[PDB]
Design a protein around this ligand. Structure first.
Ligand SMILES: Cc1cc2nc3c(=O)[nH]c(=O)nc-3n(C[C@H](O)[C@H](O)[C@H](O)COP(=O)(O)OP(=O)(O)OC[C@H]3O[C@@H](n4cnc5c(N)ncnc54)[C@H](O)[C@@H]3O)c2cc1C
Ligand SMILES: Cc1cc2nc3c(=O)[nH]c(=O)nc-3n(C[C@H](O)[C@H](O)[C@H](O)COP(=O)(O)OP(=O)(O)OC[C@H]3O[C@@H](n4cnc5c(N)ncnc54)[C@H](O)[C@@H]3O)c2cc1C
Ligand SMILES: CC(=O)N[C@@H](C)CCNCCCCN
Ligand SMILES: CC(=O)N[C@@H](C)CCNCCCCN
Lengths: 493, 499
């Protein structure tokens, strides 16, 4: 009864998609790609909004374009047919405080310059100094302010910490939840905004047998037979027999396996259960919640100086005084004690799409915990508008325009629609991507994952590889990885 | 007669002396050829008594710079201003286009950043593997990334990225690509009187220890456990330990004949091969300075950092867009006279915004440095040479063309106009006791060799200190300083524990 297959890939995100592609490319046949959702792409999804305007609600950029193999591959295609597949949208960041207004490229604040010294400080703190404890990013910044207070103006001590928090939108984690040791990463080049990441999903997906794809099939268990074989069960009752399986479900979904209770959407029952080195790796790596909110306006009626804008959370002169009077980090923490969440309670990152793509919309990024709350009320459009109205306005103000007008039903910006991500509530997602809490060793997971459950049960995905960890191109490389090792193995006869 | 003889009263030698005295050592000498102390640290006086550092000006790497931190402690204690953090957002000026910085369409700093990462990637974990010129490296980047660069970026970026010439004092075709990028260990602090740093150290040991106008002609290492030293004036001194801090450029004269040269020290026994070999894998740059003193500030103080860009051509763009490969680029370029102020990038420090003084401290590089220092007395000529770039700056800073006011003459109808009252030029490439600015690398060099060669000394008695004898702070004021404490401590302990 259990139909035989050479390779069964679980999950049709970019990793599984690339794995299948690579398998077909190497002549392997009778493979299956089982996907729980009614679409392929996974954390890569392009949704439609006001008037057919398209937006990537998952991944948007090709990072590390100097070495990104996925990007270079896309780049080659565009060189051959002159088709626009992406756009380099890095720009000079415009920073905004609720009161103080724009604070970027400020001849007195010089925030970008001290920010640079701070990252140099962090680098010096961990590089070479083996054995140093981890601590949160926040604690790292406080330590910076303490050690360099003699060389910083009050205003710098007040705003730098708020401005350097934009790093939160890289990990999807608030600075108190983020591991300092993992905060700074080396960008290997500019970023390229994909103008349709779905084009990349479709191109790869159509590079292998259509019949290979089975959507709406939720894999519920995987068993290793003593007789060198792997059995897989979709919830629709069908059973499969395969030589090799490549599991690409998100780290957060895979985590569900190391827990009792199998009736959890997305959870896979492993038999034998996942090796201790794999189960334990979950105690040393976590999941962040980067989220998105798309603001669609009728038309652009604001300044297009830049395509990158970050709103700083509120700061206070009281904070400066505390930094000035604290004897040490201990006292500083104690002194920090002196009441509800707003759009100014954390930094927010807005992509002014008008300048980069011509679309009169804003693509905003948020982080945990704000993300979990916003996505939870993503259906209440008027409440979202109420929540994001003040920063929405402050922005228009700095961009030489007027207050936003709610038009979700002449010379002012009119909000037509609001789209929200839903990655934290989606059972086949459960967050955005792998991230580190303080004390986490992302390497434990990568190692346990790339070494597999055994010669037959493998893993791929953004959380299974070092180079490009947490990125679309990393997940892509892992797919290529696992598929190639198997291709080679299958060749031997 | 003497225990330790220090050659050179630069910051290196002055620290070595300060240290030795700090460790109770006595009967030491500081033999200095110039009639002043400080070496490449010299503060001059100009119009209305304004002071400027014609030599070193900044405390680099303030996050870890030990000399700066010592200065920082002194100021936290007495509240005396000893420095001011002057890093600023750079204003870039092109003759034809004007301001090209923080441009919403050129976004030059962003590609410059990428250019920088490409450089780290090209040399990262490969082991030497063909070291080219900073210029070549930039061409490779342009060729390799043209698909993701606009025409204006390919044109202006290479000109902007050349501010790095002002960090080595070397034109991009003479400069080693492998060494071009440094590790800016935090912000820079403009020393408001490096002469204060020099004076403090000079006055921290017996004043009778210092001997100015002493040109050491030769150092003799008598196998009978002792070192012989004699200045050009005939006097002879004897010491168990000798700390040589003459600059690398001066020291390099020893490994060459004709011991007639000024400042050259004849070594007997000669400097071992390891030492002499070092000079083949390291060189000297020529960072220079020109101070333009104005009556008063009448320009916008938006920034204290201003860089004028060398001219560029769309012609250059076209070649990049057409080159089939690297070798072809070289030809199309090698086939693509008169030096002017627009022939290279010039770095202008606007002192008005940082120190309140109506002057510009301009930095220049080789090959330009020697030419300008050569005419340092021809004020009129100096003015006609920089005039156009000076007006381009004033225009961009919402002001007017400069008026030559160096010769005592007055006119009332000139208050909203910048008035040049004086020009001061450095002279390091022509000073026989410095012969350049500091250690630098031509493509193919390897600084470590000299650092090792120097740090391990000629032997247990003849040692070396100076900006070129250390890794951390190489070519910097704190590097030489530390090298001084180094040789000092070592020699100090080899005497204290004795008896
Ligand atoms: C909001 C957001 C923004 C981001 N921005 C960027 C960016 O700009 N640049 C970048 O490079 N990366 C970005 N990322 C990360 C990037 O999207 C991921 O690294 C990438 O999508 C991971 O692909 P994957 O194949 O590893 O996992 P996935 O895309 O999650 O694929 C795994 C598949 O497994 C399926 N599945 C789960 N459980 C089962 C089951 N039991 N049975 C069958 N199928 C199942 C899931 O439905 C999913 O389709 C972002 C991510 C998010 C969420
Ligand atoms: C234009 C310029 C700008 C610079 N800017 C900076 C900066 O901003 N920040 C920074 O950290 N560094 C800067 N530097 C570098 C810094 O000036 C040097 O690294 C430092 O001054 C070197 O000190 P030293 O003791 O090693 O050598 P020196 O200062 O050259 O001292 C060596 C001494 O040896 C003496 N001497 C030579 N021959 C003999 C002889 N035969 N007998 C007796 N005495 C002799 C010389 O007169 C000299 O006084 C700059 C240098 C220059 C030239
Ligand atoms: C590793 C990490 O923190 N992030 C990777 C996985 C993707 C970040 N890119 C998403 C765009 C957010 C804007 N910085
Ligand atoms: C030996 C070495 O590579 N160091 C020299 C070339 C760099 C010195 N940098 C100090 C110059 C600061 C003034 N712009």
């Amino acid at each position: 009864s259990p139909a035989k297959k050479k390779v069964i890939i679980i999950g049709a995100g970019i990793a599984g998609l690339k794995a299948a592609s690579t398998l077909h490319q190497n002549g392997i046949q009778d493979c299956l790609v089982l996907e729980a959702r009614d679409r392929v792409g996974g954390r890569l999804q392009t949704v439609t909004g006001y008037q057919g305007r398209k937006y990537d609600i998952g991944a948007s950029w090709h990072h590390d374009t100097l070495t990104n193999p996925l990007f270079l591959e896309e780049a080659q295609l565009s060189l051959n047919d002159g088709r626009t597949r992406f756009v380099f949208d890095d720009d000079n960041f415009i920073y905004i405080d609720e009161e103080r207004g724009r604070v970027d490229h400020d001849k007195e604040l010089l925030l970008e310059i001290v920010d640079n010294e701070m990252s140099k400080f962090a680098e010096l703190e961990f590089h070479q100094h083996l054995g140093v404890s981890d601590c949160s990013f926040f604690q790292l910044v406080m330590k910076y302010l303490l050690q360099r207070r003699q060389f910083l103006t009050n205003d710098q001590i007040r705003y730098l910490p708020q401005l350097c928090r934009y790093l939160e939108l890289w990990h999807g984690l608030d600075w108190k939840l983020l591991s300092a040791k993992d905060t700074y990463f080396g960008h290997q080049g500019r970023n390229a905004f994909a103008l349709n990441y779905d084009s990349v999903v479709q191109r790869i997906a159509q590079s292998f047998p259509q019949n290979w794809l089975k959507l709406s099939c939720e894999v519920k268990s995987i068993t290793r037979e003593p007789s060198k074989n792997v059995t897989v069960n979709c919830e629709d009752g069908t059973v499969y027999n395969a030589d090799y399986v490549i599991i690409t479900v998100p780290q957060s979904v895979l985590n569900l396996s190391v827990q009792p209770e199998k009736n959890l959407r997305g959870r896979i029952e492993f038999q034998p259960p996942l090796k201790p080195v794999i189960q334990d790796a979950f105690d040393k790596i976590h999941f962040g919640a980067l989220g998105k909110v798309i603001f669609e306006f009728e038309e652009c009626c604001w300044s297009n100086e830049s395509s990158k804008i970050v709103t700083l959370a509120n700061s206070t002169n009281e904070f400066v005084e505390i930094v000035r009077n604290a004897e040490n980090l201990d006292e500083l923490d104690s002194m920090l004690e002196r009441t509800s969440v707003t759009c100014w309670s954390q930094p927010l990152f807005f992509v002014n799409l008008s300048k980069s793509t011509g679309v009169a919309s804003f693509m905003m990024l948020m982080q945990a915990p704000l993300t979990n709350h916003i996505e939870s009320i993503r259906e209440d459009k008027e409440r979202l508008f109420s929540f994001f109205q003040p920063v929405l306005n402050k922005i228009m103000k700095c961009l030489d325009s007027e207050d936003v007008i709610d038009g979700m039903r002449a010379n002012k910006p009119v909000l037509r629609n609001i789209i929200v991500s839903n990655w934290t509530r989606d059972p086949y997602s459960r967050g955005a991507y792998s991230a580190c809490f303080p004390g986490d060793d992302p390497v434990d997971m990568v190692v346990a994952m790339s070494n597999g459950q055994d010669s037959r049960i493998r893993f791929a995905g953004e959380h299974t590889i070092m180079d490009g960890a947490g990125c679309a191109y990393g997940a892509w490389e892992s797919g290529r990885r696992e598929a190639t090792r198997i291709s080679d193995l299958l060749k031997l006869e």
